[PDB]
Design a binder for this molecule. Structure first.
Ligand SMILES: C[C@](O)(CS(=O)(=O)c1ccc(F)cc1)C(=O)Nc1ccc(C#N)c(C(F)(F)F)c1
Length: 240
């Protein structure tokens, strides 16, 4: 199992947010730590992605664009999984120092999005998703959102996507399963778009609510995320 060996080997380790758990859950505090956490996870997602089989086949500009467009979905999917295996989806395990209970979910003003994510997290139990299926599905999420007008070398992207779908189909090797797993993958995207909308809004009013964005995250939110929210960049859904 060469392919699964590689996915297992490259899987990021623990990322902490740096959150002060002695201060009171304030909107500004929770969100400033979520933004810092997003930057810390991006650093790891970049190194992960670049070690993936075949990823370096993509044009270099397309490499970074694909990582940026898919970052939210990747983080959501992985956090659903951490939640499942750590706390059985009782709470959202964003990081070991940033675990959300209902109260946090309300205080962050992301309650509706958090309930979806915990629902996704519960799915990993309701479907009995294996670690190996989780890893294949996560690698496919990286190849699941692109500009409607295509990437710079779109044939190379299509080839990669095709092969990652095949690897997922093998690991399954039943048609029920593939249907379920592709439906679960599709369910990530509406959640990512809700988070994207929330994040962009927060950046625009960030001065007046006293939330800090790291530079890298501010640049992505102002350059890349609007392309998604304006419909230039859209997810690849399996269904509908
Ligand atoms: C609100 C925000 O802080 C915005 S952000 O992280 O700056 C961000 C900005 C741009 C993106 F394309 C994705 C994420 C955020 O979504 N953070 C965040 C951090 C960690 C994790 C995890 N795990 C998640 C979530 F995906 F799980 F929601 C979300």
């Amino acid at each position: 199992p060469i392919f699964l060996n590689v996915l297992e080997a490259i899987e990021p380790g623990v990322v902490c947010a740096g959150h002060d758990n002695n201060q009171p859950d304030s909107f500004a505090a929770l969100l400033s730590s979520l933004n810092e956490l997003g930057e810390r996870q991006l650093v790891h997602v970049v190194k992960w992605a670049k070690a993936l089989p075949g990823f370096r086949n993509l044009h270099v500009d397309d490499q970074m664009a694909v990582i940026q467009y898919s970052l939210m979905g990747l983080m959501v999917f992985a956090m659903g999984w951490r939640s499942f295996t750590n706390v059985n989806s009782a709470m959202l395990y964003f990081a070991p120092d940033l675990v959300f209970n209902e109260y946090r979910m309300h205080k962050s003003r992301m309650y509706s999005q958090c309930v979806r994510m915990r629902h996704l997290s519960q799915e990993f139990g309701w479907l009995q998703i294996t670690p190996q299926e989780f890893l294949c599905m996560k690698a496919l999420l990286l190849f699941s959102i692109i500009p409607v007008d295509g990437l710079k070398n779109q044939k190379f992207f299509d080839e990669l996507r095709m092969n990652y779908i095949k690897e997922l189909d093998r690991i399954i090797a039943c048609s029920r399963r593939f249907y379920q797993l592709t439906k679960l993958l599709d369910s990530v995207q509406p959640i990512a778009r809700e988070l994207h909308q929330f994040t962009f809004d927060l950046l625009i009013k960030s001065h007046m609510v006293s939330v800090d964005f790291p530079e890298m995250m501010a640049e992505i939110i102002s350059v890349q995320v609007p392309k998604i929210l304006s419909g230039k960049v859209k997810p690849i859904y399996f269904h509908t």
